[PDB]
Each structure stands twice: as structure tokens, then as C-alpha cells.
RNA sequence: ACGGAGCCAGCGAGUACAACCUUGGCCGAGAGGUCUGGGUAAUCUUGUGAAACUCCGUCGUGCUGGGGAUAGAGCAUUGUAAUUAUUGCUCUUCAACGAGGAAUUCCUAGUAAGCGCAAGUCAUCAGCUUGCGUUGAUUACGUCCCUGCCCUUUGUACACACC
């Protein structure tokens, strides 16, 4: 899309806030601890630091 | 057969500095490893983002005002390089966070 | 002088095309009609035309209640008997020849004027 | 709730045309850069967003 | 250069449209005294009447005085556009006019009684004699009589 | 408010022959004459005061030394 | 010796060049002159009854000569100062665009300015020579 | 080639950069003669370096100055600094350092900011007022 | 004050899944309109040619060309909707106001003040606020006299504490 790069970073920050608030909302039962985003050249990896890995994986 | 020169350009953006500097230095070092000519990693003016809010959430009391800011940097780099070498260089060693853009500038 | 609005007497204004008055009718009316206005004044216009037709030619037309205070008087409305929505009562305005140009809201006082002392 | 009546009023523009994307509060919104967050959920989540105290 | 200025001809009192105009003031800024005649309109009518703007209103002869009072009674004929007119487009007849000292006052009063007769919100507010342009009246004026 | 000003006309804006002669006679013997210095002697209103001042600078009756706007310095010539 | 417009004071040169255009019967004068205040912010029309348009045209000529090229909106932003908005704080108000458009059209008619490739009106060879001539005349008038 | 050096002066934001060569005595700020600095007030101020040196002490030195930023008079003070710094730089790069010492002594004996940059600078404005160190007003009632 | 003539800044911000910054050119006196172009931004707006200020002229002490509130008449743009005048422009009307009582507010160097600019509020609006730059000073460089604050000593019948 055609978005200002400054606005692109702002939107990325809002995206990160959404993802973190989401992962806080659900994964509390599984002990949510943190979320990381790596926008790779090809993919966009997301890492979950969580306590109950067996439960979060399912 | 894309051996001809394309006048490619690499744009960068990062909310931080250390990883941006590392990425730019790595790109330059890889270009020297393949021995390509370049214009240096010219820096761009600090695009600082400041927005002010009433620090109180309701609106009473002594008028208190707070300022929230980021500081982003671009540091574009142009390469007089062939096609596949610069593609391999720009598609490797991208640490997270630092947004990278590639343009042929044909 | 009996009455002249913008050079046209009541004799011609009483039977006057609306758009030929839109060439008249200072800037705000011209802008309104250039943008177009809406279907709701068209319905109001038809209702008042029917009411004026059905009035028995010697009594004033029946009161037509109306919420549209954003309305300007068209030349083809003079003599109509419309109750503009003050909020509680459709307070009455009978359409005098000088109504044209002025809004409905210019005659429905939304506030009762205050009295001190 | 004849569809032609209920909710017919347009909200293209104005105070009520935008929601907080957090709570939907119309009062005190940050429309700069399309944050679309109000002042105070924004001061809550800004350190997470990337804004920081510098000066 | 400097002029001895016509010994015994420096008039002081003039009667233009039954207005007691003084002469020691500049011509445009003396005619601005007449009601309905502002600085801009007097300046334009002076420019059209080819008389010096810096020339004083005390020592003109009667011919020029009457020529201008003719000019500022039927302005549109003299390459004065519809604007620069005291009552633009004149909502009585559609013929744009420029009301003058007593005509302006009389027609303003007549418009006031028209607004009464129509019983308009603006007209009723004029009947009371209060703020009419809709401003806040918490502290506006606070003293009128 | 009160009639405490009691300010008369105090000025004749346009010169007569008499005041013409007084200006051209008292033009010397004054080491300094300005616009308002000329106004002080009641002989001119003040808008025509500078007109008379520049009109005394026609045959060098009064030499100018500074020619700034709103303030020119004129000294009698000898 | 060699003289340029930048080598003479702005005010004396501008008045002299306005007078020079006054002498020549060129530089057609638009109809609506003597009527317009050159800006809404101004309170009263120019004190200069005749020749003020020549002054503005001369100012346009020198002002284009200084840089590469300008436009009518650019002069509109430059022309006109502050408007006494009744009680309201004095702001910047753009000058009347019609007067500047007519000034530039008349200057094109004189061949002192033409349409620039970048978009706008740039100085002309004949125009810059004429400005150099009037600058030399004013400088020699001074000394 | 021709001996030439490049300097600058500042006032609060205003930057005046000067290119000085060995020529025939040109003082052209913004491609204009020095006698024609607009303010008309601080004109002698741009004369200040020149007139402390004496024009006779530099006639085969020419200077061209490009300037921006700041206000009018701040620009003029930047002009002062630019010309003084350019002249002293040319002396100390090409003629001699005894000359630089004597020019610095002559300069600094008057308006010390001739060669040194005005180091004190505006400070940020804050909330709770309409000035950097100003409060709105208080009522108590 | 008003006319002309000069012509100096900085922080910002700016259209995309929608319609912003607007250059330049034709119009209109204006507001404003139109044709086209760039700019997702050190590119274009923009070097935001900003005011205050600088020079030359008119006014010359008179509620005067100070002052522009209050009133009408028109023309424009935003808005589905401008009437209780949205706002801008044209013309006219011209108020009070003579540097303002007791009291009281802010301030020690790019500071007070004057002057604007940009951003936030935004469809449209500011007199506001937040940031920025510009012209840039007078007066201390100190003391508890007033209002309080801190630490210690002392006294109290006070502790929901001299209200
Ligand atoms: Mg209340
Ligand atoms: Mg300007
Ligand atoms: Mg101006
Ligand atoms: Mg001025
Ligand atoms: Mg003022
Ligand atoms: Mg201040
Ligand atoms: Mg005025
Ligand atoms: Mg700048
Ligand atoms: Mg008055
Ligand atoms: Mg002021
Ligand atoms: Mg507010
Ligand atoms: Mg007890
Ligand atoms: Mg007690």
C-alpha cells in the first residue's frame, strides 16, 4: 500500500499493541508473559514467551 | 542475464539507532565483500514525532502537560550494482525491527 | 406602494415559477438549490398544495404541522397555514407574502424570552 | 426501526464519526497520524507503542 | 509649491444633503461625516471626480461640490460597480442603490418596522433591543440603559 | 465627560499672506525648526507645516542635515 | 563600469524604474485600477492615485530578476501584510491575485518576463537588459 | 590555486557563510555591495571588522557571503562574525600568525563577539504559561 | 494610524482504500472558482518571501484617518442540514474607551514583554492550548518586612491537631 513511512511505523506500533493486548487477554490461563514480532523480509514471525508451553501449543 | 547495472536503492527506517547502524554497516561491508561502488550511508534528519496530552485523565488540578515522542531515521543508500548480488545481500541479515525497502530505480 | 420584494409585485409573485425566483433569492438560497435540497421539502410542498386546493376558497387552509425548521418559503407557498415545530406546539405561521426568503426557524422561537424582576 | 429511518443519519464526519478503537469514546480523540486512540488509553499503551519520555 | 490660497475664499461651513460639513478637513475625510458615506466610498468618488485627494474641503468651489453630489447619488452610471453601494441590490425592487445621509436612516428604520411586521426572530429581537447576531449574552454589554 | 478640556481650535491649517510673511521672516533666527517646532508657534496646523518646511527648502533658506521620515532636522542657513 | 540591479538600493531604484515606466506609454493599465486595495487586509486604497500600479510592476520586475522564477500566488503571499481583523489578532492575509496576474501579463507584454519551464515567470533577456539600464541610470543620478 | 578559505558566523539561528579569496577587494554579501545592507541601522556594524582593520590593510582580498536564518539584525551580526572570521582565517593560513595575533588584539578590544560565536541560545517554552519561564495568572477566587 | 517601497525564521504537517499539502497557468476586486502539475515527503507545498520591523509619503492632538464593538445590504465556501447572524470578502453605521479605586498577578537573560508562525481541537470555524522562531530589554544578584517552607530548641489544657 501507499502509506507514509512515519505512519507505517505508527501503524506497526498500534499492531504490536493490539497483539500484546490480545495475547494478554487470552493466554493468562496458560501464563502469558510476552510477545515479540519480527517483520522478516519474507514472513512476519511472532514469538510467544509463555509459561505453560504445553497448553499454549495445544 | 541481468549483469547490467540497475542503479538500485535501499531505504531504511527504524525507531531505534543501534540496529539501524548495524544494518547499514553490514550492507556496506557486504557490498565491499562483493566489491561494488556506492554512495555512502548518507544520514537523514531525525524525524522526531512529538504529541502532547493532558497528563490528568479527567481534567482537574494544576494544568499538567506531558510529551510523548519517537525519533526515526532513514539513511538511504544507493548502489551501482547488478541484480542478483544486491538481492542476495538485502535478503540476508535483517535483524528484527528495522524496516528495509528496496527499489530498482529503473 | 403595495408590496415589492425584488421588483416583482405580489400580482406576479403569487403565480411565480420557483427556479426563476432561484435566479433571485440571495446567495444562500442559490447555493441551497444549486446543491439540490431533498425529497422531504418535495413531500411538504405536495402536502401544502393539496391542503391549499382543498381549502374552501374563503377560509384559510388547514394547519399543516411541520418539523422542518430548515425550510425557506418558496414563492408558491403564500397564504399557507403551517405549524412550525417549536418543540412542543407546532406554533402557527400563516404564510404572508414576505415569508419568502426567510426560514421557518425565523418565526418559531425555541426559547420563551426571559423575564427578570 | 424502519431501515430508512433508524440509523439513517450519516456519520461521515464530525465528533461521532470516529471511535477510539479502544473504548469507542468520542470525547478527546487523537486523530494525528490516525492513532484514533483517545488521550488516556494512549498514555496507557504508548510506552508499549513506542512513544517515550525524553524531554 | 505653496499657495497663498485665494485670500478670502477659505470656506468653513458647507451644506451637502443638509449636513453641516466643515472645510478644514481633507475632502474625502470631511465628506465621510455624511451618513452612508465612508472613507473608502468618499475616496473613490473623489478619484473619479478627478479632484486632488490631498486637496482640502474648505476651498473648493460649488461646481465640484455639486458634481460629486451628483456622482454619489447615481453611482452605477459612473463606473462604480454594484458593490460600493450602501444598500446592495436593495431588497425593495432589486435595483442596487446607495442610500445617503437621511435616506439611509429612514430606510434602516423602515427595514426595522418591516422586520417587526413580519414578526421574525431577528425582528422580534429588534423589538426587544438585544443581541441579535446570536452571540453569548452572559456578559455581552451588561449595560444599555 | 466633563467640559474640562476647553481646547480651542488653536491652529490655522492653511497659510494666509500675513502668516506667509511671518514664516518667511522668522525662518532665520531659529537655530532649529521641525514639523512640531513649527506647530508650536501656532502658525500652522501641522500637516501643512512640513509642506511649508520643504517649501522653505527651495532657495536654501534652511539647510537640512538629516532627512529621515517623520523627523527631518533643519537648521537656519548663513 | 559594470553595474547590476543588486548593486543599487532597492527603494531609489524601484521609484526610478516606476517613473521610467510612467514615461513610456507601454504597460497597459487594467480597467479595475483606481478601485482596488491590492489586498483585503488593507483598510484604505493606495494613497498614490496614479503610478502605484507602475510601482508594483517595477517591483515584480526586480523581484523576478533577483531569483530564477516566481508565480502570482507567491507574490500574493508576499504582497500585503497584516489585516486588522477588527478586534482579532492580526494575521497574514494574501494580497489580491487579480492585480498580480494583470501585472505579470503586462510585463509579459513588455517582454521583460516570460513563462519559465519550471512553471511560473522568469526574467527575460530584454527585461534584464532594461533593468540593468535603469539601474545604471539611477546609479549615475546618485553620482 | 588562488589562496582562499571559508568561514561562517552565527546569531541565534542565523548562519552567514563566507568564501574569501585573494582578489581585488570585493565585499559582496548575497551578491550585494556592503554599503547596501537593508536594516540601514546596523550598517556600520558590518563595517566594524573592516574599519577596525583599516581597508588599507586588505585590498587584494575579496569576500563573497551567502546567508540565511534568523532575523534581520541577527543576520547582520552573523555577517559581522563571518567577515571577521574569514579575514583572520586568511591571515593565519597565508600571511603570518603575528598578523593573526595583532588582528585578534585589535578586534577583541571591541565587541568581543567579533571573532567568537555568541554561545547563549534560546531555551524551550513550557506548559503552564505563555513563555519559557512564565505562568498564566492566578485568581484565588 | 494609514498608504506605498524592502523582505529575514524555525520547530511541524500533509491524499488509500480516499479523497490532504497544495505549485504553476487562466478567471473574479475580494473571498473564492477553474485547468493542470508534483509530494506518502531534506525532493513538492516551502527557502512556508510570517509579522513586528526598515525607507519614503499622507495625517498633526480633534473621540481625529485612534479605536471596530454594535447594526443593515449583498457576494462567496463548508456542511444532509448555516435560522439563534458557521466562517471569509464588499459597502455603510460608527459605540464605550482620556493608561483606569481599593486590591492583585507573573518575572533575573535570549529572560519579561512585543510580534507572529506551526501543531492539537477540525467538514467549517478560534479569541484557546501545546511547541517554535523573531525584535529582544529595565531592575537585583539580596532579606525575612508580608505570604509561606525546611531544621533545631522551647511551651501547650491541642491530636477529628488554632477552622
Ligand atoms: Mg449559563
Ligand atoms: Mg512578509
Ligand atoms: Mg506589504
Ligand atoms: Mg507599515
Ligand atoms: Mg493596531
Ligand atoms: Mg512571550
Ligand atoms: Mg483604521
Ligand atoms: Mg525556513
Ligand atoms: Mg471617530
Ligand atoms: Mg500589537
Ligand atoms: Mg479548549
Ligand atoms: Mg485529646
Ligand atoms: Mg480561635
UniProtKB/Swiss-Prot annotation, chain D:
It comes from the Eukaryota. One of its GO terms (cellular component) is cytosolic small ribosomal subunit. InterPro entries: Ribosomal_uS14 (IPR001209), RIbosomal_uS14_euk_arc (IPR039744), Ribosomal_uS14_sf (IPR043140). Keywords: Ribonucleoprotein, Ribosomal protein. Pfam families: Ribosomal_S14. Transmembrane segments: none annotated. Belongs to the universal ribosomal protein uS14 family. This is Small ribosomal subunit protein uS14. The gene is RPS29.
UniProtKB/Swiss-Prot annotation, chain H:
The keyword Cell inner membrane does not apply. InterPro entries: Ribosomal_Su5_D2-typ_SF (IPR020568), Ribosomal_uS9 (IPR000754), Ribosomal_uS9_CS (IPR020574), Ribsml_uS5_D2-typ_fold_subgr (IPR014721). GO terms for cellular component: cytosolic small ribosomal subunit. Residues 132-141 have a biased composition (Basic residues). Residues 121-141 are annotated as: Disordered. One of its GO terms (biological process) is maturation of SSU-rRNA from tricistronic rRNA transcript (SSU-rRNA, 5.8S rRNA, LSU-rRNA). Keywords: Ribonucleoprotein, Ribosomal protein. NCBIfam families: PRK00474.1 (NF001749). Belongs to the universal ribosomal protein uS9 family. This is Small ribosomal subunit protein uS9.
Amino acid at each position: 500500500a501507499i502509506i507514509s513511512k512515519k505512519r507505517k511505523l505508527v501503524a506497526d506500533g498500534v499492531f504490536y499493541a493490539e497483539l500484546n493486548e490480545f495475547f494478554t487477554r487470552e493466554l493468562a490461563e496458560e501464563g502469558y508473559s510476552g510477545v515479540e514480532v519480527r517483520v522478516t523480509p519474507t514472513k512476519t514471525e511472532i514469538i510467544i514467551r509463555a509459561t505453560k508451553v504445553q497448553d499454549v501449543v495445544g | 542475464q541481468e549483469v547490467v547495472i540497475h542503479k538500485i536503492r535501499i531505504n531504511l527506517t527504524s525507531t531505534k539507532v543501534k540496529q539501524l547502524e548495524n544494518v547499514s554497516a553490514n550492507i556496506i561491508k557486504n557490498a565491499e565483500t562483493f566489491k561494488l561502488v556506492k554512495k555512502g550511508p548518507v544520514r537523514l534528519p531525525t524525524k522526531v514525532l512529538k504529541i502532547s496530552t493532558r497528563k490528568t485523565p479527567n481534567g482537574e488540578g494544576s494544568k499538567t502537560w506531558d510529551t510523548y515522542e519517537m525519533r526515526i531515521h532513514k539513511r538511504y543508500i544507493d548502489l551501482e550494482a547488478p541484480a542478483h548480488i544486491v538481492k542476495r545481500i538485502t535478503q540476508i541479515t535483517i535483524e528484527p525491527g528495522v524496516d528495509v525497502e528496496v527499489i530498482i530505480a529503473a | 406602494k403595495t408590496y415589492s420584494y425584488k421588483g416583482v409585485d405580489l400580482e406576479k409573485l403569487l403565480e411565480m415559477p420557483t427556479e426563476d425566483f432561484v435566479k433571485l433569492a440571495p446567495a444562500r438560497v442559490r447555493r441551497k438549490f444549486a446543491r439540490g435540497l431533498s425529497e422531504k421539502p418535495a413531500g411538504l410542498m405536495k402536502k401544502l398544495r393539496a391542503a391549499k386546493l382543498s381549502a374552501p376558497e374563503n377560509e384559510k387552509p388547514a394547519v399543516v404541522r411541520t418539523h422542518l425548521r430548515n425550510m425557506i418559503i418558496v414563492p408558491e407557498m403564500i397564504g399557507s397555514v403551517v405549524g412550525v415545530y417549536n418543540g412542543k406546539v407546532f406554533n402557527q405561521v400563516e404564510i404572508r407574502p414576505e415569508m419568502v426568503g426567510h426560514y421557518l426557524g425565523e418565526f418559531s422561537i425555541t426559547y420563551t424570552p426571559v423575564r427578570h424582576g | 426501526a424502519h431501515e430508512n429511518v433508524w440509523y439513517s443519519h450519516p456519520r461521515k464526519f464530525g465528533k461521532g464519526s470516529r471511535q477510539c478503537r479502544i473504548s469507542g469514546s468520542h470525547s478527546g480523540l487523537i486523530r494525528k497520524y490516525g492513532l484514533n486512540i483517545d488521550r488516556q488509553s494512549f498514555r496507557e499503551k504508548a510506552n508499549d507503542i513506542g512513544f517515550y519520555k525524553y524531554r | 509649491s505653496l499657495v497663498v490660497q485665494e485670500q478670502g475664499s477659505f470656506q468653513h461651513i458647507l451644506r451637502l444633503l443638509n449636513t453641516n460639513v466643515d472645510g478644514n478637513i481633507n475632502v474625502v475625510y470631511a465628506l465621510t461625516t455624511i451618513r452612508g458615506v465612508g472613507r473608502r466610498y468618499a475616496n473613490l468618488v473623489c478619484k473619479k471626480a478627478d479632484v486632488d485627494l490631498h486637496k482640502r474641503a474648505g476651498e473648493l468651489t460649488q461646481e465640484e461640490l455639486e458634481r460629486i453630489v451628483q456622482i454619489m447619488q447615481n453611482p452605477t452610471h459612473y463606473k462604480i460597480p454594484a458593490w460600493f453601494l450602501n444598500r446592495q441590490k436593495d431588497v425593495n425592487d432589486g435595483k442596487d442603490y446607495h442610500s445617503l445621509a437621511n435616506n439611509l436612516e429612514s430606510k434602516l428604520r423602515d427595514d426595522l418596522e418591516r422586520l417587526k411586521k413580519i414578526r421574525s426572530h431577528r425582528g422580534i429581537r429588534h423589538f426587544w433591543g438585544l443581541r441579535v447576531r446570536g452571540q453569548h449574552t452572559k456578559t455581552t454589554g451588561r449595560r444599555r440603559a | 465627560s466633563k467640559k474640562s478640556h476647553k481646547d480651542k481650535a488653536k491652529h490655522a491649517v492653511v497659510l494666509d499672506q500675513d502668516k506667509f510673511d511671518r514664516i518667511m521672516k522668522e525662518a532665520p533666527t531659529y537655530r532649529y525648526v521641525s514639523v512640531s517646532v513649527l506647530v508650536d508657534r501656532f502658525k500652522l496646523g501641522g500637516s501643512l507645516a512640513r509642506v511649508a518646511l520643504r517649501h522653505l527648502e527651495n532657495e536654501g533658506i534652511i539647510k537640512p542635515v538629516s532627512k529621515h521620515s517623520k523627523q527631518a532636522i533643519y537648521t537656519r542657513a548663513t | 563600469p559594470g553595474v547590476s540591479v543588486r548593486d543599487v538600493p532597492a527603494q531609489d531604484f524601484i521609484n526610478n524604474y516606476a517613473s521610467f515606466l510612467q514615461r513610456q506609454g507601454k504597460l497597459e493599465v487594467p480597467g479595475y485600477v483606481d478601485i482596488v486595495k491590492t489586498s483585503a487586509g488593507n483598510e484604505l486604497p493606495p494613497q498614490d492615485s496614479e503610478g502605484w500600479f507602475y510601482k508594483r510592476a517595477a517591483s515584480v520586475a526586480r523581484h523576478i530578476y533577483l531569483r530564477k522564477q516566481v508565480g502570482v500566488g507567491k507574490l500574493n503571499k508576499l504582497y500585503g501584510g497584516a489585516k486588522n481583523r477588527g478586534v482579532r489578532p492580526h494575521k497574514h492575509v494574501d494580497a489580491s491575485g487579480s492585480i498580480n496576474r494583470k501585472v505579470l501579463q503586462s510585463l509579459e507584454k513588455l517582454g521583460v518576463v516570460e513563462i519559465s519551464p519550471k512553471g511560473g515567470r522568469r526574467i527575460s533577456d530584454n527585461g534584464l537588459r532594461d533593468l540593468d539600464r535603469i539601474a545604471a541610470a539611477t546609479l549615475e543620478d546618485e553620482e | 590555486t588562488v589562496p582562499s578559505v571559508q568561514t561562517f558566523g552565527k546569531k541565534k539561528s542565523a548562519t552567514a557563510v563566507a568564501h574569501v579569496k585573494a582578489g581585488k577587494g570585493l565585499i559582496k554579501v548575497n551578491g550585494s555591495p556592503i554599503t547596501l545592507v537593508q536594516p540601514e541601522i546596523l550598517r556600520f556594524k558590518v563595517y566594524e571588522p573592516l574599519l577596525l582593520v583599516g581597508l588599507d590593510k586588505f585590498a587584494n582580498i575579496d569576500i563573497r557571503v551567502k546567508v540565511t536564518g534568523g532575523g534581520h539584525v541577527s543576520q547582520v551580526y552573523a555577517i559581522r562574525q563571518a567577515i571577521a572570521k574569514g579575514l583572520v582565517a586568511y591571515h593565519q593560513k597565508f600571511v603570518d600568525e603575528q598578523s593573526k595575533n595583532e588582528l585578534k588584539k585589535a578586534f577583541t578590544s571591541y565587541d568581543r563577539t567579533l571573532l567568537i560565536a555568541d554561545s547563549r541560545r534560546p531555551e524551550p517554552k513550557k506548559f503552564g504559561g505563555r513563555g519559557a519561564r512564565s505562568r498564566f495568572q492566578k485568581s484565588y477566587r
